[PDB]
């Protein structure tokens, strides 16, 4: 009954988050494409962390070590299924709370469980209606995502996009910069939709 309805804690809610490539066309006449979006303008399904650790780093700063700090509540599970079907890569997360924080934010890709690349930034509240708001906004997609994507998408069959998908998944932590408690973990595993249909997500908790 304490149990999450969406990606967030009382601390800390997620509003928005979106991974999205703009064609040189948008100066025209803008237009952009989701590869991944969740918008959060009954409880949550649950999934047992341990199923997953393998899926992450596995020493200091893997999902078991995270998971035993703590606190539990802050653990979800994002179920992308990326809309494959399509200039400049970016990524944008909005976050809300009641509390003035100092947010670290850190975007961990992994392939096979390894770490490949890693991404901390950064964000300090800014106090609108009431409520603090943290703003990354039009971040620009890492590298390797980004050929990641090219390459994924010239697989001739979406089954083998979604054999690579299999071994691929990113973690981010969002942590109070000042007090190094942590206030969000969310881990993303990924299948590529199919060309009928647009980017959609399952979230869950992460129990155990
Ligand atoms: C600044 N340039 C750098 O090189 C530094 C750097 C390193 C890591 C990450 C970033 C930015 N962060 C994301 O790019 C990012 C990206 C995603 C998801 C991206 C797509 C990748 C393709 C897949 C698909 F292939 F499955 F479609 C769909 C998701 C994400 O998700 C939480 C969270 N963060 C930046």
């Given at each position: 009954?304490?149990?999450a309805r969406?990606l ?5 809610q997620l509003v928005?988050?979106s991974?999205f490539?703009?064609p040189?066309?948008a ?9 991944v979006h ?6 949550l399904?649950?999934?047992?962390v ?13 999902l ?11 653990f ?6 990326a ?6 890569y ?7 709370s009641?509390?003035?924080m ?6 961990k ?10 991404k901390?930034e ?7 209606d009431?409520?603090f708001?943290?703003?990354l906004?039009r971040?620009?997609?890492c590298?390797?995502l980004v050929?990641?994507?090219?390459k ?20 981010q932590?969002?942590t ?5 408690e942590?206030?969000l ?21 992460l129990?155990?």
């Amino acid at each position: 009954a304490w149990q999450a309805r969406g990606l967030g804690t009382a601390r800390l809610q997620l509003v928005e988050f979106s991974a999205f490539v703009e064609p040189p066309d948008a100066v025209d006449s803008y237009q952009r494409h989701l590869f991944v979006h969740i918008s959060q303008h009954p409880p949550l399904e649950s999934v047992d962390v341990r199923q997953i650790y393998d899926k992450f780093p596995e020493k200091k700063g893997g999902l078991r070590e995270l998971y035993d700090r703590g606190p539990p509540h802050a653990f979800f599970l994002v179920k992308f299924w990326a809309d494959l079907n399509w200039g400049f890569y970016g990524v944008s997360s909005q976050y809300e709370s009641l509390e003035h924080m100092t947010l670290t934010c850190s975007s961990k890709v992994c392939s096979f469980g390894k770490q490949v690349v890693e991404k901390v930034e950064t964000e300090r509240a800014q106090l609108e209606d009431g409520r603090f708001v943290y703003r990354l906004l039009r971040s620009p997609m890492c590298e390797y995502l980004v050929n990641f994507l090219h390459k994924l998408r010239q697989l001739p069959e979406r089954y083998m996009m979604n054999s690579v998908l299999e071994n691929f998944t990113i973690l981010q932590v969002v942590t109070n910069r000042d007090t190094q408690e942590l206030l969000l973990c969310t881990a993303y595993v990924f299948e590529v939709s199919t060309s009928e249909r647009g980017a959609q997500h399952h979230i869950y908790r992460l129990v155990r």
